[PDB]
């Protein structure tokens, strides 16, 4: 028994929310007190460059950006049960980080 915290990070909302749904549903089926998805503020990484490779034109700019979404799940259960809650078909653009009550 610990306070296990799963952090999920992704660049798209769909797969991230569906992996969160799978984890929450699997944890609810095995009777866990699941403090559900906490949504941290999305980080927008922005780079604004010049469009032209040379230095001639009408001075137009290109605004690229990349969003990073973060979700948290808090479980209160032994380790070996979270070892089967997770490991169920994680989507590619999603990255998990288990923190088992300590660094």
């Amino acid at each position: 028994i610990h306070r296990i915290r799963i952090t999920l990070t992704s660049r798209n909302v769909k797969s991230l929310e569906k992996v969160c749904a799978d984890l929450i549903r699997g944890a609810k089926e095995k009777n866990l007190k699941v403090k559900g998805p906490v949504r941290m503020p999305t980080k927008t990484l922005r780079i604004t460059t010049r469009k032209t490779p040379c230095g001639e034109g009408s001075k137009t700019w290109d605004r690229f950006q990349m969003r990073i979404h973060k979700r948290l799940i808090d479980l209160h259960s032994p380790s070996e049960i979270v070892k089967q809650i997770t490991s169920i078909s994680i989507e590619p653009g999603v990255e998990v980080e288990v923190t088992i009550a300590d660094a």
Binding site: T9, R11, K43, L45, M66, I68, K70, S87, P92
Partner: protein
């Protein structure tokens, strides 16, 4: 552990790794019909899935070339030894893949073939493979020493909006030749198909599709059944 890095830098570094691996494989497996790469992270190994048309030459001679590619990827990107396996897989339909068709046109031009018969052959293959439309643009020193651009279109081709990000796939390539370099732009408009891998799932956002009404024989005089 001792190595910890912010999520911004980590995601940018992952993207940069994928970009460099894709560029390396594009230069290395050009004449093998390389289409794309997909990095899948698994608990025991890291699987690099190579999408190619002629996957037997990617595999090499009894696995030699795939082992060499695995070795250079491990030695360049600093993976632990034995923790990276390279698998190859055949692209399903070759006609609806602008990268594969641009490479095919490139190698057809590298061998002695005229530009017009080659572009028409590629265009005809793309259209016969189910594409709604295709555009092939070859620009360079085609006729003499004054460059021009020849484009070959057949079918529908949207240009603007958000649907051009999932209904159109493009590819730009170069062909080094004796007199200069030729530029090849191929863009294909994929067909709509629900629950399929041929193309997009969601329809075009301005294509309303009314469902045909069922035949409605009307009643004459009230009747009721006591089942």
């Amino acid at each position: 552990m001792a190595v910890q890095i912010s999520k911004k830098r980590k995601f940018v570094a992952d993207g940069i790794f994928k970009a460099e691996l894709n560029e390396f494989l594009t230069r290395e497996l050009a004449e093998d019909g390389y289409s794309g790469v997909e990095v899948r992270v698994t608990p025991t190994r890291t699987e690099i899935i190579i999408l190619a048309t002629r996957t037997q030459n990617v595999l090499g001679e009894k696995g030699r070339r795939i082992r060499e590619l695995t070795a250079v990827v491990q030695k360049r990107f600093g993976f632990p030894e034995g923790s990276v396996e390279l698998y190859a897989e055949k692209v399903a339909t070759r006609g609806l893949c602008a990268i594969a068709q641009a490479e095919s046109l490139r190698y057809k031009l590298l061998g002695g073939l005229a530009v017009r018969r080659a572009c028409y052959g590629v265009l005809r293959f793309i259209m016969e493979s189910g594409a709604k439309g295709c555009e092939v643009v070859v620009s360079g020193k085609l006729r003499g020493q004054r460059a021009k651009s020849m484009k070959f279109v057949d079918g529908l081709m949207i240009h603007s909006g958000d649907p051009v990000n999932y209904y159109v796939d493009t590819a730009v390539r170069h062909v080094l030749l004796r007199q200069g370099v030729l530029g090849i732009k191929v863009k294909i408009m994929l067909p709509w198909d629900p629950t399929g891998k041929i193309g997009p799932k969601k329809p075009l956002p301005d294509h309303v599709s009314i469902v045909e009404p069922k035949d409605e024989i009307l009643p004459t005089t009230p009747i009721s059944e006591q089942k």
